[PDB]
């Protein structure tokens, strides 16, 4: 439903942010 | 509705964050 | 409207985060 | 109340994130 | 528990973001 | 309660993001 799906979309966008931030960290110290 | 539309705007902004962070990761990767 | 205004302030802050991240990505791109 | 204050605290933490991201962008292109 | 699980996935993703940001900060510090 | 505790964990993680981003900003500033 509208609210459950909105929170899922927020979680998914934050997982994409987390992946990219780990890629940036890994470029500096991996 | 007001709550649904605010949660949609939060998801949209986070997707823009995610895309920019992917571009920063791409710039730093070998 | 306390709940709606707090979600709108979260969206506003994330839009500022997205603007700044896009500025960082542009600074690093060719 | 518990939920209104929690969302305010989330907005405040995101404003601090936004300020720091703008400082990073400004260090690169200001 | 769909609403609680989506908020917990948001927290999980943000903890991953925080870990990666701390790794970036450590890479840049003296 | 479950919703209150998830929102507290989201705020805590974002404060950790904010602190790390402040440290990255400090590293890059003159």
Residue numbers in the entry:
A (entry chain A), B (entry chain C), C (entry chain B), D (entry chain A), E (entry chain B), F (entry chain C): 1 to 30
Copy the relevant paper text.
αHBs are oligomers of 5 or more α-helical peptides that assemble into coiled-coil structures with central solvent-accessible channels. We targeted two properties of αHBs: oligomeric state, which directly affects the internal diameter of the channel; and the identities of channel-facing residues, which fine tune this dimension and introduce different chemistries. The αHBs are loaded with an environment sensitive dye (in this case, 1,6-diphenyl-1,3,5-hexatriene, DPH) that binds within the channels and fluoresces. Accordingly, challenging the array with analytes leads to differential displacement of the dye across the array to give a fluorescent fingerprint.
